[PDB]
Amino acid sequence: MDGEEVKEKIRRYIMEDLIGPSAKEDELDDQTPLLEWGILNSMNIVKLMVYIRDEMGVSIPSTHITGKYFKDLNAISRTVEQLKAESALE
Ligand X SMILES: *P(=O)(O)OCC(C)(C)[C@@H](O)C(=O)NCCC(=O)NCCNC(=O)c1ccc[nH]1
Stretch binding ligand X (CB under 6 A), from 10-18, 41-49, 72-80, 81-89: 41-49
Q: Which of 58, 67, 77, 81 binds ligand X (CB under 6 A)?
A: 67
CA proximity to 76, closest of 28, 37, 41, 31: 31
Q: Angle CA(12)–CA(13)–CA(14) in degrees, nearest 5? A: 90
Q: Which of 36, 46, 78, 87 binds ligand X (CB under 6 A)?
A: 46
Nearer to ligand X, 1 or 42 (CB): 42
Asked if 44 and 70 touch (Cβ cutoff 8 Å), the reply is no
Applying CB under 6 A, the residues found at the interface with ligand X are 42, 45-46, 65-67, 70
